[PDB]
Task: structure prediction
Amino acid sequence: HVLQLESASDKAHYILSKDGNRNNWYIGRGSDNNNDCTFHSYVHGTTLTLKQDYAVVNKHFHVGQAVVATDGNIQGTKWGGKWLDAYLRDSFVAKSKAWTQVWSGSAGGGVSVTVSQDLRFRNIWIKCANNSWNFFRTGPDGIYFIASDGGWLRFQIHSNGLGFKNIADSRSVPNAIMVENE
Amino acid sequence: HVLQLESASDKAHYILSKDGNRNNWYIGRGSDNNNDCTFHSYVHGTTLTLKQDYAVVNKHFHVGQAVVATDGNIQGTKWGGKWLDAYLRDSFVAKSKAWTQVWSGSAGGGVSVTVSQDLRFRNIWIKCANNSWNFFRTGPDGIYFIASDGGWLRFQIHSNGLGFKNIADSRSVPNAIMVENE
Amino acid sequence: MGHVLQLESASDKAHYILSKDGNRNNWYIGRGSDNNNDCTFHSYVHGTTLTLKQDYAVVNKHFHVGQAVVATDGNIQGTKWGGKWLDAYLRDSFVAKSKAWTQVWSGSAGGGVSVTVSQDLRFRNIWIKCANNSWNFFRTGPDGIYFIASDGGWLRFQIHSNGLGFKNIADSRSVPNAIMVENE
Result:
């Protein structure tokens, strides 16, 4: 009930398979003075090693068809087939604590301007009178109102978030827009 | 120092254990013309394979007591014993970029209404005068103010977020409330 | 079958390959125990083990994939997470759904008056109480000048000193007396 392999103290002992003259795979204690135990394909160069404080495989690791990658990323059906890094980015609001100017100029009553970021469901700050930032969080394309410094601004988000239009304002003309980074 | 297994080129070579007449487990290169090396239980049908570009197990994979599931979900004490998908959902604000109406009507000064979701710590838009949406983010049940289109609205979130009351308004009567999806 | 290394045992009895160096049990592979079909690759010296069981495979210690690590508490470390553990990457990268708030200042700051607040208020959700006992919401950006038509009239305020300073620049009948912040 035991196939007994015996070597001298601290000497290698492993099972080696060769097909033809080719080293194919091995399992066991591959080196003298080293107690790591390895299961290795020479042909694939793919390895599992039992080491002192952990086990390791040297390439990506599949669990069924889910994948644990060598960079620590995970892919599987639970993440909608995405890698986890992308699932997270798409799924949850980023704590960037940074903003970006998407537009600068002057947009009086009736004037529509155009930006290269989708402004829908974003945190924005609009600068109108008195060199202050007026906060707003947009929903989808639509009509919004803010009692911005100077008086007030009624504005429209249109064109799938790329259009920003001053519908009407009372002494509160937008001259800059920042957006919180995603 | 080596147990040497030798085969013809590209022929299977493996070690097979049988208990009585039952195939029980094997290790090695299980098939001709295929360099994949496998450690397999025939009884359990549970397998580790070393392949060209990855190593793979065919069922859920435990690391101590933590679990990496075949769908890519992970369970562990670091996630409070939850699966990671649920930890994430519970822990972080959802980037849903979508909204839902929670009430529609007319709530003049003093009028209280029931809303369809708990509005505490939520992103909301209230429509009052002039067909525009006024943004607000609520905290707990309490008293809030917004200089909404038309003038202003002092409002109350009550009844564990299920009640919305117009305390007072100046020419700014609410008629619709949207909430950002969670 | 003459070119397979065949290990044959009685039904439901252990059979494994054991390697010993000198007198020391060093490693084994196979069916370690009677009446039990679990198959194990184990180092006796390291005490590190892989086991194939009925419904799962298991390693008994942290498991590395290249240099990435899946720990026994379910945490993951890797270059994708900036070399951080995923728990910290998540905490640092994404907005907490805390649904709770904390008071960061209480007092009375009229026009021109500046106060110290107890948290960095940059890129935070805050609520300022001015006139009429109501909360006025604002989300801040970095240090800078901001405006809110808060209950009473309006308030132009400044976040300064790396988020630790709050100054009433000017107000119209809307003097701040308390500020709450959403918990991170």
The CA atoms of residues 109 and 168 of chain B lie 5 Å apart. The two ends of chain B are 63 Å apart (CA to CA). The longest strand of chain B covers residues 22-29. Chain B has one helix and 17 strands.
